[PDB]
């Protein structure tokens, strides 16, 4: 089931996927429909957590985001992300191989505008709760920053920390999508 970029300059162009448990195309089409309805991506900086194939970040990249930081701990997955960045031939992509919770913990001096996260099933939801909290204090978020998390309906829902305003939860087949934005 080889996936392809949905919208943007790279619309239609194919990207590769590792082995894994990746996002369905309707989930990706819908997430960007939701996000792009309420923000324009052009000039926006993006953080893609547990990037896997990079499909989500390559999508935002295609639709005009300025930069995407892909964070992914598996080396074969990081290689797949790099191949895909090359095949699409778009600028602004940076790749950071490492443990997502370690990277988020280490902080940053420049906030992003959209955080994309697809945590694998070995990650517990309460630990994802901790990453969302860290996004707020460790410099990753600014006022208006959107966060989106994809999980299996099997998984326990997220508990968002103060300072975030939840958007309406969505479900697609057996996948839950949670969205919020920073208030600051
Ligand atoms: N601490 C971790 N940090 C970064 N990546 C991880 C970590 N734990 C597991 N992963 C990887 O995160 C990815 C989770 C995937 N479901 C993401 C899929 C991706 N969004 C896609 O549809 O292509 C897998 O590639 C894991 O190897």
Curated annotation (Swiss-Prot):
Enzyme Commission designation: 2.1.1.-, 2.1.1.171
Ranges for region SAM-MT-fold: 24-184
InterPro entries recorded: DNA_methylase_N6_adenine_CS, RNA_MeTrfase_RsmD, SAM-dependent_MTases_sf
Effect in UniProt of substituting residue 13 to A: Does not show any significant binding to either DNA or RNA in vitro and lacks m2G966 methyltransferase activity in vivo
Coiled-coil stretches: none
Regulation: Phosphorylation stimulates DNA binding and DNA methyltransferase activity, but does not influence secretion. Exists in a compact, folded state at both pH 7.5 and pH 4.0, the acidic pH that mycobacterial proteins may encounter in the host lysosomal or endosomal compartments. The protein is more compact and stable at pH 4.0 than pH 7.5.
Localization: Secreted; Host cytoplasm; Host nucleus; Host nucleus, Host nucleolus
Documented effect of changing residue 4 to A: Does not show any significant binding to either DNA or RNA in vitro and lacks m2G966 methyltransferase activity in vivo
The UniProt record lists the keyword Transferase: yes
GO BP term (any one): rRNA methylation
Annotated spans, Beta-hairpin: 2-17
Catalytic activity: guanosine(966) in 16S rRNA + S-adenosyl-L-methionine = N(2)-methylguanosine(966) in 16S rRNA + S-adenosyl-L-homocysteine + H(+)
Region (Linker): 18-23
Outcome of substituting residue 172 to A: Does not affect nuclear localization
Effect in UniProt of substituting residue 176 to A: Shows reduced nuclear localization
GO cellular component terms, semicolon-separated: extracellular region; host cell cytoplasm; host cell nucleolus
Keywords: Host cytoplasm, Host nucleus, Methyltransferase, rRNA processing, S-adenosyl-L-methionine, Secreted, Transferase, Virulence
Pfam families assigned: Cons_hypoth95
Result after altering residue 14 to A: Does not show any significant binding to either DNA or RNA in vitro and lacks m2G966 methyltransferase activity in vivo
PTM section of the record: Glycosylated.
Quaternary state and interactors: Monomer. Within host cells, interacts with histones H3 and H4.
UniProt miscellaneous comment: Can complement rsmD-deleted E.coli cells.
Function description: SAM-dependent methyltransferase that binds both to RNA and DNA. Specifically methylates the guanine in position 966 of 16S rRNA in the 30S particle. In addition, can methylate and modulate host cellular DNA within an infected mammalian cell, altering the host epigenetic machinery. Binds to specific host DNA sequences and methylates cytosines predominantly in a non-CpG context.
Similarity-based family: Belongs to the methyltransferase superfamily.
Entry text on domains: Forms a two-domain structure with a short hairpin domain at the N-terminus and a large C-terminal domain with the S-adenosylmethionine-MT fold. The N-terminal domain helps target recognition and is important for binding RNA and DNA substrates. The C-terminal residues dictate the nuclear localization.
Protein name: RNA/DNA methyltransferase Rv2966c
């Amino acid at each position: 089931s080889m996936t392809r970029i949905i919208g943007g300059v790279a619309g239609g162009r194919r990207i590769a996927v590792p082995p894994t448990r990746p996002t369905t195309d309707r989930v990706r089409e819908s997430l960007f429909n939701i996000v792009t309805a309420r923000r324009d991506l052009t000039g926006l900086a993006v953080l893609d957590l547990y990037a896997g194939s990079g499909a989500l970040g390559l999508e935002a990249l295609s639709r005009g985001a300025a930069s995407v930081l892909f964070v992914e701990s598996d080396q074969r997955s990081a290689a797949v992300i790099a191949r895909n960045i090359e095949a699409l031939g778009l600028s602004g992509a940076t790749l950071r191989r490492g443990a997502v919770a370690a990277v988020v913990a280490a902080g940053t001096t420049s906030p992003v505008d959209l955080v994309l996260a697809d945590p694998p099933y070995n990650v517990d939801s309460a630990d994802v709760d901790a990453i969302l909290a860290a996004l707020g204090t460790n410099g990753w978020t600014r006022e208006g920053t959107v966060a989106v998390v994809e999980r299996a309906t099997t998984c326990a829902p997220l508990t968002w920390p103060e300072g975030w305003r939840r958007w309406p939860q969505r479900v697609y087949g057996d996948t839950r999508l949670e969205l919020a934005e920073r208030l600051f």
